[PDB]
Amino acid sequence: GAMIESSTTIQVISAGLPRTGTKSLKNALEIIYHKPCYHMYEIIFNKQSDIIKWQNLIHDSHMITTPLTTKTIAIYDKLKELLDGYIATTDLPTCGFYKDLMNIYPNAKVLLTIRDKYDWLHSLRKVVLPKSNDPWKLKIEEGDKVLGLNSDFYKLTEDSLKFAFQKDDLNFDDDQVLLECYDEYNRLVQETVPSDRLLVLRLGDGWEPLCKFLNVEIPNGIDYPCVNSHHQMTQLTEQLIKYKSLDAIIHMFPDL
Numbered sequence: 120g121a122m123i124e125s126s127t128t129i130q131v132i133s134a135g136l137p138r139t140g141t142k143s144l145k146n147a148l149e150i151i152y153h154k155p156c157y158h159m160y161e162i163i164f165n166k167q168s169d170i171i172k173w174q175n176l177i178h179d180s181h182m183i184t185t186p187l188t189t190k191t192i193a194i195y196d197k198l199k200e201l202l203d204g205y206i207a208t209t210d211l212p213t214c215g216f217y218k219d220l221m222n223i224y225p226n227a228k229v230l231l232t233i234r235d236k237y238d239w240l241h242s243l244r245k246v247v248l249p250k251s252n253d254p255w256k257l258k259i260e261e262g263d264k265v266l267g268l269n270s271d272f273y274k275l276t277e278d279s280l281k282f283a284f285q286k287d288d289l290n291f292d293d294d295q296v297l298l299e300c301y302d303e304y305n306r307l308v309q310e311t312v313p314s315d316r317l318l319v320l321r322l323g324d325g326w327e328p329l330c331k332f333l334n335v336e337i338p339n340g341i342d343y344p345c346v347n348s349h350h351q352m353t354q355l356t357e358q359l360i361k362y363k364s365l366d367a368i369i370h371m372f373p374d375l
């Protein structure tokens with residue numbers, strides 16, 4: 120196909136929850152668009168100063184009146200600031216803001232990444248939200264400290280998940296609650312976003328449906344990304360603990 124000059128603004132809003140292939144999708148969108156895609160790893164690795172900004176935004180988010188009202192505009196302005204220079208959103212904390220992002224970026228299309236609910240829960244428990252009594256939680260925390268992440272990082276994860284699930288509080292250690300929230304969330308995205316504007320992706324779908332949806336050619340000779348497995352995250356955590364810096368081990372984790 121011909122090369123065309125793409126606008127550096129949000130073109131793709133991915134509503135998919137953490138552990139549904141968001142990092143692979145981030146990488147895929149960056150391959151297509153040649154501009155950055157937002158993801159929690161963007162915060163971890165490039166923008167830790169954004170943590171307090173997202174926390175503030177979530178704190179004020181209850182005041183969003185679903186469109187435009189005054190306080191809504193103030194919130195939309197901060198969202199647009201956070202996402203300046205990016206061409207897509209994936210993962211927490213952005214995913215729960217999908218309806219709002221649709222208003223802010225009326226010409227953006229929406230994706231929903233999904234998978235088997237139990238595989239999702241298993242993955243979530245290994246990486247994002249281990250149970251309180253799980254010894255592995257201590258290892259995650261130790262590795263995270265090496266990255267400069269503290270309690271405010273976990274607070275952002277918690278609060279952005281509460282926001283996505285529209286719960287005032289949430290028993291994070293309760294598998295049944297999380298499973299119900301996952302199903303309800305995915306159902307609601309599909310009820311809310313007009314089908315013309317939505318593509319539902321299952322893990323393994325690869326380039327074809329995504330590229331068709333976006334009117335772009337399939338990147339030549341480049342496989343669809345498969346990254347961020349829980350096994351890989353376990354190794355990352357262990358290596359951070361072992362070496363006590365990211366820069367010492369980063370050569371071992373390409374595409375991160």
Ligand SMILES: Nc1ncnc2c1ncn2[C@@H]1O[C@H](COP(=O)(O)O)[C@@H](OP(=O)(O)O)[C@H]1O
Binds near residue numbers: 136141344350
């Ligand atoms: N192209 C692909 N095909 C199949 N699974 C993929 C994939 N890309 C990512 N995944 C899976 O998606 C999960 C990561 O999602 P996220 O990036 O949103 O945190 C991991 O699940 P597992 O932990 O079960 O391995 C990972 O293996």
Ligand code: NA
């Ligand atoms: Na399986």
